[PDB]
């Protein structure tokens, strides 16, 4: 997999953000994770965490997996990095997302994220509390 450039346009919620990619606006949905909706418990915390991580980053990068790059809603599906730190992983490690939506052929970082979820759960963090 390869990291490609993007810039933040606007935060949206815990697991979606609006980025400019190849000079086009796109909503990106983070691969392999599920955050609570804003209206749900920890939903506000997950939105805040993703907004802060993206807005503070000097460098945002998109990394597509091997399989589908856009979902049925036209959202880009990717791993998103902020100054080299994967936002998908960081949410799960903090207990602000669960590993979820693991489809065959877009699951390169599944085991990395499951390890982070196990550690968040052992710490009883947030969703696991
Ligand atoms: C994360 C992800 C979601 N989706 C679709 C599945 C779900 O369909 P439904 O909308 O029919 O439930 C929806 C979940 O996204 P959200 O969690 O953003 O709502 O996004 C994919 O198709 N591929 C993916 O990799
Ligand atoms: Ca969600």
Swiss-Prot record:
Biased composition (Basic and acidic residues): 109-125
Subcellular location: Secreted
Region (Disordered): 109-129
Transmembrane segments: none
Residues that, per the record, bind Ca(2+): 15, 34-35
Residues forming the catalytic site: 29, 37, 75
Domain of life: Bacteria
Name of the protein: Nuclease A
Full-length numbering of the shown residues: 89 to 223 of 231
